[PDB]
Amino acid sequence: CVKIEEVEFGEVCRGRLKQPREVFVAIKTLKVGYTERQRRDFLSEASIMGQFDHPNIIRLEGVVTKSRPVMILTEFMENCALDSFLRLNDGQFTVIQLVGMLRGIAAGMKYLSEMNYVHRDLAARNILVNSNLVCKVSDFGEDDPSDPTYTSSKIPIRWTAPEAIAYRKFTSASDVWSYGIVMWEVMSYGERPYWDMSNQDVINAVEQDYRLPPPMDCPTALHQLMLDCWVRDRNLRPKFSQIVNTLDKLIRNPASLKVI
Secondary structure (H helix, E strand, O other), X not given: OEEEOOOOOOOOEEEEEOOOOOEEEEEEOOOOOOOHHHHHHHHHHHHHHOOOOOOOEOOEEEEEXXXXXXXXXXXXXXXXXXXXXXXXXXXXOOHHHHHHHHHHHHHHHHHHHHOOOOXXXXXXXXXXXXXXOOEEEOOOOOOOOOOOOOEOOOEOHHHOOHHHHHXXXXXXXXXXXHHHHHHHHHHHOOOOOOOOOOXXXXXXXXXXXXXXOOOOOOOHHHHHHHHHHOOOOHHHOOOHHHHHHHXXXXXXXXXXXXXX
């Protein structure tokens, strides 16, 4: 039922699906000479992905394991990752549209969290965008390599709550910390969280109560909600339902988004 047009575990192609109407899709193929371990992990990521169903979580259309090569089919998102999408479009969206993007992402995270799923790598680079500007939470798919995005231990320092760095305490509340960072990315149109602070400086800074400032022209309401997400006391951070609720409050009362 699949076809491949313009082309970790293998390739990353653009394809076309035809189910009993035809759509564009994203296809992960698995390279020649994959290991049992490269095959076991590649697919179980599909398993993880295919237990979800929500308009802000990336859809697994399907998977074909009955032939070589074996594929994971997911939904096509024309505008790619949110962070590059925001960079290419600096200043081009209204505050309401940005809140809209955040609202969708907060809604996907509320779904995952009610499913007892902890994402662990929530970041703009893992949020995909379609042609209607709908943002969907994604996974399984570099400004300065000296301060890399990921540190091996698997941990994206700049996006990770201090208790998840220090003690591997990964929970929905650690995802909420990450969402705060995602808010800051969106509102700044894709700046690097913490800029030319070394990865180590960021851990040090955070433990010292440094929090990222408001992006240019960011409404005080929105920055306040970031600060809430970055409470050192994980128990005080809002839940994702509360974040969705706060963002809806702001959409119902847009005058309140004018304070800067």
